Amino acid sequence: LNPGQRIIRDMEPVSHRTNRKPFTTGQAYSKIEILNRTANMVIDSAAECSYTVGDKYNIVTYANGVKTKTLDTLLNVRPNPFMDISTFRRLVVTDLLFEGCAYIYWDGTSLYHVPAALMQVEADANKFIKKFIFNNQINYRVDEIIFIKDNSYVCGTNSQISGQSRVATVIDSLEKRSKMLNFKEKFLDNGTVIGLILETDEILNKKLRERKQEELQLDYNPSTGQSSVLILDGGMKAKPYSQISSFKDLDFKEDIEGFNKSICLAFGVPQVLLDGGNNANIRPNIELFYYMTIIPMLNKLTSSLTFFFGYKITPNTKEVAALTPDKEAEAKHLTSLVNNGIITGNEARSELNLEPLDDEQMNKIRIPAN
Amino acid sequence: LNPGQRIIRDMEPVSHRTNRKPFTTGQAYSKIEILNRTANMVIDSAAECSYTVGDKYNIVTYANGVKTKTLDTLLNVRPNPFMDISTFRRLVVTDLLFEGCAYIYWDGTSLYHVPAALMQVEADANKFIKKFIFNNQINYRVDEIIFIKDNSYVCGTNSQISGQSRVATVIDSLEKRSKMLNFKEKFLDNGTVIGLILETDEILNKKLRERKQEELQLDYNPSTGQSSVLILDGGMKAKPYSQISSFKDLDFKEDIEGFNKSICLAFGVPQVLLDGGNNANIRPNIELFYYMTIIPMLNKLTSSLTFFFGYKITPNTKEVAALTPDKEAEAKHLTSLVNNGIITGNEARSELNLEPLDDEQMNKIRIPAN
Amino acid sequence: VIGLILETDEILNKKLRERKQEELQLDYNPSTGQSSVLILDGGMKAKPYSQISSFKDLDFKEDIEGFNKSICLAFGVPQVLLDGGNNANIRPNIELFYYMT
């Protein structure tokens, strides 16, 4: 046991909600299209990757007596007798994203989801965590909650608990982008556009002055008029005016592009995926996105699962439509291994997502020799 | 024993925390998003690399009697009876990053984590280190704590104690970038936009003047108007004004890009990882990131581990999704090695992350000979 | 940073002058205002001022890049290692760094 755990409790007795302003985040996700699309692709991608359970670690875990097949079916087919697999996975991933942490309940035989927007974790004076408090009055325990924590540095010191919300960091950038974009719309709806100013030093009958004003407006526009010369009489003067604040000054494109690139940067999506990319970009960018962004996100979940159940669980995609291996190269390398005897044919079948055959000559290596 | 160790202790009796301002760093991590993404990539990438324990060094280390398999389980499956593997690695790496150093406690059988933001190291007049003081009154020892130090040159002389926090070098750049970015939104919300400036040397009825100023603004906006000509009567003049301080002057984009490269440079992540890259950019840049940045960072940890336990521990990834070898090239070199008899087939499978199979012909080198 | 410089050759009650200054500031900003034309009465003029020392003059970026290259030069680290490199850039530069430095 850790002799310094009680000081850890004293320095942070309870978890801290990190999505400091939730309503602004919800408003932006609802009515801002870069956050909407980026969060949607991240969550949907973290919902397509299947989980493959491995061997049993001969250790004591919080959940014991669960067989491999039951865990596999509840984790890849249907978690709860009442809820979907993709819905539950998306809920967990969106809790991990929009909130710092993500929480999953564990019944006797079913694996329920609990939102992290209301749960608060209370540290223990002795071990690691005393008891979770969902909103209030729940008081789950610890053996029945799967804890997913995204790394955080909140307040002075990092925390054994809680988590820092990825979406909560882009709120300032989203507000800046929205204000900067609304400024152009209001500038267009407000700024005045004129084509000609005439001046006279004597008052000339406001009614008739206005009538001549619309006469000049309609008559000297090539779409609706067929005149191009003015003969000003009586000393009326034409002031050579200029435009005060032209639209060319408001060059917000570069700043808006910077804000968009930053927002795509925080979630981790490459900018090429949202745009159109060449053949040299699409496959490497899909690989970079999925692996280096999502697979940490799912690795947190799978590590928490292998802590909770003791079964080695890893994010093994091998089936997502975005990372389907190149058929020619994959076939070439699998055939090379099969011919040269490194792997059996059945393993190649398993890699090709086929089903192994109960054949004799395939279950043993070829060993070409001669 | 070192004759000069007492002078070393006299020149620096105790360690000193190097993250001089923790709260500003926390607020930057929580509300500045380039820093969030860079730190998250570094920490998560430093949490995916598995650890392989090698042989036993016949030396007297601080931890004795620990079995190889028990150390492997503690270091790759479950460090604690109460906390995860990914969470533990993430805490250790974020302590190494945001603070200068990182500390890991060691019970008889459990390998607990302790924060480095609170704990101070006291040098020894004779050997190396008297003890470790966690805030106070705990007073761990040295025989039971694992010490991971990031190289530092603080004050006049470099220290065998303490350490330099990489993030603390970035706070000034973060403040500069935040101020520079806030200046643009404040300039937009504060600057004035004018369409016309009409003057008269005599007073024209403020109420009716304001009514005409609303009518004249709404009438000459082509979105909401059907007039474009002015007939100024009574001697009212139109001053040919010009915009005083246009927005085109504030060319902050290059400065903000410089500050973004500022933020990313200190952590070590290449700028291509954040953006999109070609076939020739993604995998080489991920290789640079992992190797050059992370693997020294985990090499500090593994060197401290091999000091503590005496077992050769190295960061052996071989499984991280972002460094999966090219299937075709990997197949080609493995098959060539197997055919030409340099390595056995079983160790080829081992390098393929599969399970070696107990065969008679495969356990020996093929020896092509003819 | 200034938007307007309106001038008057007579004194006009500092308190209300400041009040109208604030009102005309807030009114003629499209973000927080819904007006774009200004009618000046009483002989008040509008001086066509200009920006004295614009931020565009301070082009420090090239000098700052030179200083960064100079700092990275003394230690020996190639500039490609810190940035992103292609297949042709990255491994020869890692080799040059390790070996030569």
Author numbering:
A (entry chain J), B (entry chain K): 11 to 380
C (entry chain L): 203 to 303
What do the study's own words say?
Bacteriophage T5, a representative member of the T5-like family of siphophages, serves as an excellent model for studying the assembly, infection, cell wall perforation, and DNA ejection mechanisms of this phage family. The T5 tail, which comprises 40 trimeric rings of the TTP and a distal tip complex, is connected to a unique five-fold vertex of the head by the connector complex.
We built atomic models for the portal, adaptor, and tail terminator of urea-treated empty T5. In contrast to the mature T5, the DNA and TMP are ejected in urea-treated empty T5, resulting in an empty head and an unoccupied tail tube. Structural comparisons of the portal, adaptor, and tail terminator proteins before and after DNA release indicated that no discernible conformational changes had occurred in these regions during infection. No significant differences were observed in the conformation of connector proteins before and after DNA release, and these proteins appear to be conserved across myophages and siphophages. However, T5 and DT57C lack a stopper in the connector complex, suggesting that the dodecameric adaptor may assume the stopper function, serving as a docking platform for the tail by binding to the tail terminator protein and ultimately completing the formation of the connector complex. Notably, the tip complex of the empty particle became detached for urea-treatment-induced reasons.
